[PDB]
Homo-oligomer: A and B are copies of this chain.
């Protein structure tokens, strides 16, 4: 089941009776985009490319069309894990080009590719294993999503044990049937919350899978009567959903972060990589935490980190070093939530870590104390800064950042910020029922 050439794809389409091909790409804000191609037209698509409206990539801030061409990558062909009676369905990715023949710089996948390209200039290749947390909710009588609980279980609980036990198994099976190579799946801290850990793979292939994961899990749950939610904080008072990103660099086949003779067995480049991450994380929190609801997860008192720090012992730090060493040496960034665009988030993580190695950015001493247990003046002395407290603050930090603008390009940078600003200007004017409950009788 390893596809390399267009002839590999075409023969598998004929042998497996694939009738529809679905393109897969994402817009600037991480929404999954697609259109359907009948398989009869697939051979022409491989030869000539497929023309489509490129403003779909631009987000919801689009006004004008832009004719663009999608050059299909046969190595991304993959059959979807459901079987219509008519025939099989498969997804395929590709690269977006302008009519003049130049690659469209506004595709988030292209943005990730340039970061991979800059990493290869120094001989580095990046591997990532994301830990994706989500909620399994009930549908109402009309089939609409709700936040109604499907179980009351806790961390690593063997739950649910009713019919929800079968949908969770169906989700894991569907991913395995598609070649995901899941490492582990388990119940998360909050009721009805679940986590699936990806295999440690190369960043580009992993990023494509994070996108595929989201609509596969969504579709499988829907067809069983449940709703899979990737909201950061759908429920007050319980754990939010993060997307922890374990990352590692390789050069000449060996792990760049590992060093057998150092006290912590962590290399100098590992320290530099953390320094770049710590130096720039505030500038692209708006990308790792892209929606207004993201910052309801980034509040003190839960697993989510709100203070910029690193440690090898405390969990609640922004960056944590797992105990694993050798070829598996990795660092874990714990702030992102599964609403982020994986292409933009992974690219900025790579660029920030690369800038740490380039500029020999010291990360400081690790914070082994639970920072939540500290006063504001204590953190002030130790130089412990915090993440932006809402989307608007994150927007302002990203607005004036030379690092983020150069890494995304002036087109992705502008369009992402403009959409997020429109988002906040809508939210900031809403009068919420909490305000009514608090002030109607008081004032």
Q: Which residues of A contact B (CB under 8 A)?
A: 19-20, 22, 24, 27, 31-38, 40-41, 50-53, 55-56, 60, 62-65, 67, 84, 86-87, 89, 99, 143-147, 154-158, 161-163, 165-166, 169-170, 172-173, 176, 181-186, 215, 218-219, 222-223, 229-231, 233-236, 291-293, 296, 299, 313-316, 320, 322-324, 338-339, 370, 389-390, 392, 427-436, 438-443
Contact = CB atoms under 8 A, between A and B. Distances in A.
Contacts of A234: 431, 436, 440
30 contacts: A20-B169, A20-B172, A27-B156, A31-B157, A33-B155, A33-B158, A35-B186, A36-B184, A38-B172, A38-B176, A38-B181, A40-B181, A50-B184, A53-B155, A63-B370, A86-B169, A86-B173, A144-B441, A145-B440, A161-B218, A230-B443, A231-B439, A236-B429, A236-B431, A291-B443, A296-B431, A338-B443, A389-B392, A427-B434, A430-B432
Contacts of A51: 322-324
B84 A323 contact: no
B162 A19 contact: no
Contacts of A145: 440-441
Contacts of A182: 38
Q: Which of A65, A234, A299 is the most central at the interface, judged by chain B CB atoms within 10 Å of its CB? A: A65
A299 B425 CA distance: 9
A235 B36 contact: no
A50 B156 CA distance: 14
A440 B32 contact: no
B19 A173 contact: yes
A156 B57 CA distance: 9
A13 to B, nearest CB: 14
A436 B158 contact: no
A84 B169 contact: yes
A53 B197 CA distance: 12
Contacts of A323: 51, 67, 99
Given A33-B158, A36-B184, 12 more contacts: A64-B370, A67-B322, A86-B173, A144-B441, A146-B440, A147-B436, A161-B215, A165-B219, A231-B439, A236-B430, A390-B428, A430-B432
Nearest to A25: B156
A56 B169 contact: no
A210 B311 CA distance: 39
Contacts of A223: 162-163
A439 B295 CA distance: 13
A336 B157 CA distance: 23
Contacts of A63: 370
A158 B215 CA distance: 8
Nearest to A392: B389
Contact of A157 (B32, B315, B322): B32
B184 A35 contact: yes
A431 B314 contact: no
Contacts of A163: 143, 222-223
Nearest to A69: B323
Contacts of A24: 158
A231 B185 contact: no
A324 B67 contact: yes
A262 to B, nearest CB: 16
Contacts of A35: 156, 184-186
Nearest to A176: B38
Given A51-B322, A432-B430, A185 B147 contact: no
